[PDB]
Swiss-Prot record, chain A:
It is found in: Cytoplasm; Nucleus. Belongs to the 40S cdc5-associated complex (or cwf complex), a spliceosome sub-complex reminiscent of a late-stage spliceosome composed of the U2, U5 and U6 snRNAs and at least brr2, cdc5, cwf2/prp3, cwf3/syf1, cwf4/syf3, cwf5/ecm2, spp42/cwf6, cwf7/spf27, cwf8, cwf9, cwf10, cwf11, cwf12, prp45/cwf13, cwf14, cwf15, cwf16, cwf17, cwf18, cwf19, cwf20, cwf21, cwf22, cwf23, cwf24, cwf25, cwf26, cyp7/cwf27, cwf28, cwf29/ist3, lea1, msl1, prp5/cwf1, prp10, prp12/sap130, prp17, prp22, sap61, sap62, sap114, sap145, slu7, smb1, smd1, smd3, smf1, smg1 and syf2. Residues 35-72 form the CWF21 domain. Involved in pre-mRNA splicing. May function at or prior to the first catalytic step of splicing at the catalytic center of the spliceosome. May do so by stabilizing the catalytic center or the position of the RNA substrate. The chain holds residues 2 to 145 of 293 of the full protein. This is Pre-mRNA-splicing factor cwf21. It comes from Schizosaccharomyces pombe (strain 972 / ATCC 24843). The modification Phosphoserine is found at S77. Belongs to the CWC21 family. Residues 60-72 have a biased composition (Polar residues).
From Swiss-Prot, chain C:
Belongs to the TRAFAC class translation factor GTPase superfamily. Classic translation factor GTPase family. EF-G/EF-2 subfamily. It comes from the Eukaryota. This is Pre-mRNA-splicing factor cwf10. The gene is cwf10. Belongs to the 40S cdc5-associated complex (or cwf complex), a spliceosome sub-complex reminiscent of a late-stage spliceosome composed of the U2, U5 and U6 snRNAs and at least brr2, cdc5, cwf2/prp3, cwf3/syf1, cwf4/syf3, cwf5/ecm2, spp42/cwf6, cwf7/spf27, cwf8, cwf9, cwf10, cwf11, cwf12, prp45/cwf13, cwf14, cwf15, cwf16, cwf17, cwf18, cwf19, cwf20, cwf21, cwf22, cwf23, cwf24, cwf25, cwf26, cyp7/cwf27, cwf28, cwf29/ist3, lea1, msl1, prp5/cwf1, prp10, prp12/sap130, prp17, prp22, sap61, sap62, sap114, sap145, slu7, smb1, smd1, smd3, smf1, smg1 and syf2. The lineage of its organism: Eukaryota, Fungi, Dikarya, Ascomycota, Taphrinomycotina. Component of the U5 snRNP complex required for pre-mRNA splicing. Binds GTP. It is found in: Cytoplasm; Nucleus. It comes from Schizosaccharomyces pombe (strain 972 / ATCC 24843).
Swiss-Prot record, chain D:
Involved in pre-mRNA splicing. May be involved in endoplasmic reticulum-associated protein degradation (ERAD) and required for growth at low and high temperatures. Required for pre-spliceosome formation, which is the first step of pre-mRNA splicing. This protein is associated with snRNP U5. Has a role in branch site-3' splice site selection. Associates with the branch site-3' splice 3'-exon region. It is found in: Nucleus. It comes from the Eukaryota. Belongs to the 40S cdc5-associated complex (or cwf complex), a spliceosome sub-complex reminiscent of a late-stage spliceosome composed of the U2, U5 and U6 snRNAs and at least brr2, cdc5, cwf2/prp3, cwf3/syf1, cwf4/syf3, cwf5/ecm2, spp42/cwf6, cwf7/spf27, cwf8, cwf9, cwf10, cwf11, cwf12, prp45/cwf13, cwf14, cwf15, cwf16, cwf17, cwf18, cwf19, cwf20, cwf21, cwf22, cwf23, cwf24, cwf25, cwf26, cyp7/cwf27, cwf28, cwf29/ist3, lea1, msl1, prp5/cwf1, prp10, prp12/sap130, prp17, prp22, sap61, sap62, sap114, sap145, slu7, smb1, smd1, smd3, smf1, smg1 and syf2. Interacts with prp1. This is Pre-mRNA-splicing factor spp42. Signal peptide: none annotated.
Curated annotation (Swiss-Prot), chain E:
It is found in: Cytoplasm, Cytoskeleton, Microtubule organizing center, Spindle pole body. Transmembrane segments: none annotated. Coiled coil: none annotated. It comes from Schizosaccharomyces pombe (strain 972 / ATCC 24843). This is G-patch domain-containing protein C1486.03. It comes from the Eukaryota. The chain holds residues 717 to 797 of 797 of the full protein.
Length: 104, 344, 50, 48, 81
């Protein structure tokens, strides 16, 4: 009749019901560092893309200078030599990785 | 466009007929109920039992009244209500994880990591959209989470489906000759990613707040051997493997109560909330009214009959309303065989 | 966006907003589901209007 | 919260709580600000 | 299970197994759409029950129960067109 305690009706038993509370109830790192290595390679690639953006901005500056010389469209500063200066960047970053591995 | 509702279901109840002779009647009643109640989600489990998802206890009460009386005039057995969970990852994948196509040549490896604080919420609210030019997505991510360029440009898809809180990213180190091949296989690795993220490996549920960044996909021969149906299970399996190695966790939904009680009823509310794993964000007098306003969170799993306890103990005063708020990670460790709880 | 019970729970009323055109009783219409698209042309159902 | 729910009856869910408090003394005017009512002060908003 | 069996079988024949994000009105199972290639005109809709591949005839009403179909018949219908 209440919280699962009691009998449905006191009729039929010699008792009045009246359930009571018990009153005595006891109520008690990363193993594959190649992850970091690949993250570093990816961030180096994104730095390369950042330098490509810088190259495009320099190309816009070159286009403005060419238009000014004509006064006295869109052009590209360097088609492939920027890849060689990027190769220098690869050499420098490889040297940096070698030095860091030497330090560790 | 499908209706965008203001709440999720996150409240589950399992039913079956009182006697098995009337199962078809229960099925018909469930079909009609799914027609009539918009956020009800009737599902059938592998045990054969039928679960129903509703917003709250009053929602399920009215739903079951209709099921018993309106549609299928039978007697049903109703299990105790339970919350609907979700699985997340709290740490980056411990090791790289790879899978192989049944042809055993195309190898795909994945690593995963938890997201930052904002991205899940910003996906759900609409600060980002997949149906956007990549330029806007890249600039938003870079501006808001200080992310770098190519990662921002490599966001492939959200899962499961749009508004999902999982990001498919690819980091293939560039310098990849087979841009055409990778772009060919991307359009049907998306589907495998969605399939995996919809049905979690930890349990048959969705995954939340995890980005599955692709690491390396290698495949030498020509396009005859590139079968989408041959490659999707590989993507699903590698997603599962990376997620498991990422020390997965369980997410639980939490409500947001709003109790309007007089000054003298505050201690009872505080005691109820403390007992029911809830904490009070804000407790201020209500301006212009003699009542006090109490705003608090309480997990869905622990909010069974919170309203009834509150109204009984406060002598009828202190009416409260419970709104689904967000998801919270369960404090335990889901995969820990060392715990042997007593089943009482 | 809605379905409503009849005075007895036997059949439903579809609550619709006619965005364009005209509709007459007995008209033949095709019903498009929640995910019908160019990929999924199988959610269409041809039905009458009673 | 129970299967086998037959012959049960449903009850009124809630009523708007009454905020009337009878006057203590007749000297006061009928319309008077009760000190029990919290002040209308909400300098916590961001409007247009 | 039978799901993995049909998945690997579709892998062997270089088919596609796309899940239709739907539940059948009668059995509630997830419906799947099988397509041979980028061509979409020949697409067979399938739901699975008791390790049996079930299919609906094109243009038939929903209340009509789906009829079963084996692997050889799917190959027979996809290889002659």
């Amino acid at each position: 009749s209440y919280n699962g305690i009691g009998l449905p009706t006191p009729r039929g038993s010699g008792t009045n019901g009246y359930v009571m509370r018990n009153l005595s109830h006891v109520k008690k790192v990363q193993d594959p560092s190649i992850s970091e290595h690949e993250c570093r390679r990816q961030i180096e690639s994104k730095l390369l893309l950042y330098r490509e953006q810088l190259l495009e901005e320099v190309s816009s500056q070159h286009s403005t200078d060419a238009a000014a010389s004509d006064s006295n469209s869109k052009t590209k500063s360097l088609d492939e030599a920027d890849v060689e200066i990027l190769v220098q960047k690869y050499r420098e970053q490889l040297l940096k990785e070698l030095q860091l591995q030497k330090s560790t | 466009r499908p209706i965008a509702h203001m709440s999720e279901s996150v409240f589950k109840v399992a039913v079956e007929p009182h006697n098995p002779s009337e199962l078809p009647k229960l099925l018909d009643g469930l079909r009609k109920t799914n027609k009539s109640y918009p956020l009800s989600i009737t599902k059938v489990e592998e045990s054969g039992e039928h679960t129903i998802f509703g917003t709250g206890e009053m929602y399920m009460d009215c739903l079951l009244y209709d099921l018993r009386t309106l549609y299928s005039e039978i007697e049903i057995r109703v299990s105790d209500p339970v919350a609907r969970f979700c699985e997340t990852a709290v740490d980056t994948s411990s090791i790289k994880c790879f899978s192989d196509t049944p042809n055993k040549k195309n190898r795909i490896t994945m690593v995963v990591e938890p997201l930052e604080k904002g991205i899940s919420n910003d996906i759900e609210n609409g600060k980002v959209n997949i149906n956007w030019p990549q330029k806007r997505i890249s600039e938003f991510f870079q501006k808001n989470y200080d992310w770098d360029l190519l990662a921002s440009r490599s966001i492939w898809a959200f899962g499961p489906d749009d508004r999902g809180t999982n990001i498919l990213r690819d980091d293939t180190l560039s310098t990849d000759v087979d841009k055409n091949v990778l772009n060919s296989v991307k359009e049907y690795i998306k589907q495998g990613f969605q399939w995996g993220t919809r049905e979690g490996p930890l349990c048959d549920e969705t995954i939340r707040n995890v980005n599955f960044r692709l690491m390396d996909v290698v495949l030498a021969p020509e396009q005859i051997y590139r079968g989408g149906g041959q490659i999707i299970p590989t993507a699903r399996r590698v997603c599962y493997s990376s997620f498991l190695t990422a020390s997965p966790r369980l997410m639980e939904p939490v409500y947001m109560v709003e109790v309007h009680a007089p000054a003298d009823s505050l201690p009872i509310i505080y005691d109820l909330l403390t007992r029911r794993r809830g904490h009070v964000l804000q407790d201020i007098p209500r301006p212009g009214s003699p009542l006090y306003l109490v705003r608090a969170l309480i997990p869905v799993i622990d909010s069974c009959g919170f309203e009834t306890d509150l109204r009984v103990h406060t002598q009828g005063q202190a009416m409260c309303q419970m709104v689904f708020d967000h998801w919270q990670v369960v404090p335990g460790d889901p995969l820990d065989k060392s715990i042997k709880p007593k089943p009482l | 966006t809605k379905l409503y019970n009849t005075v007895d729970a036997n059949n439903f009323y579809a609550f619709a907003r006619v965005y364009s055109g005209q509709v007459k009783k007995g008209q033949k219409v095709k019903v498009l589901g929640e995910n019908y698209s160019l990929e999924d042309e199988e959610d269409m159902v041809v039905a009458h209007i009673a | 919260y129970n299967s086998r729910a037959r012959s049960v009856a449903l009850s009124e869910y809630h009523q708007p709580s009454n905020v009337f408090v009878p006057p203590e003394d007749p000297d006061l005017p009928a319309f008077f600000w009760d000190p029990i009512i919290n002040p209308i002060t909400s300098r916590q908003l961001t409007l247009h | 299970s039978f799901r993995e069996l049909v998945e690997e079988f579709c892998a062997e024949n270089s088919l596609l197994f796309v899940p239709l994000r739907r539940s059948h009105l009668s059995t509630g199972s997830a419906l799947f759409r099988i397509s041979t290639q980028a061509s979409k005109a020949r697409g067979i809709t399938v739901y699975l029950r008791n390790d049996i591949i079930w299919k609906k005839s094109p243009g038939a009403s929903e209340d009509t129960p789906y009829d079963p179909i084996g692997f050889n018949e799917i190959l027979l219908m996809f290889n002659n067109n």
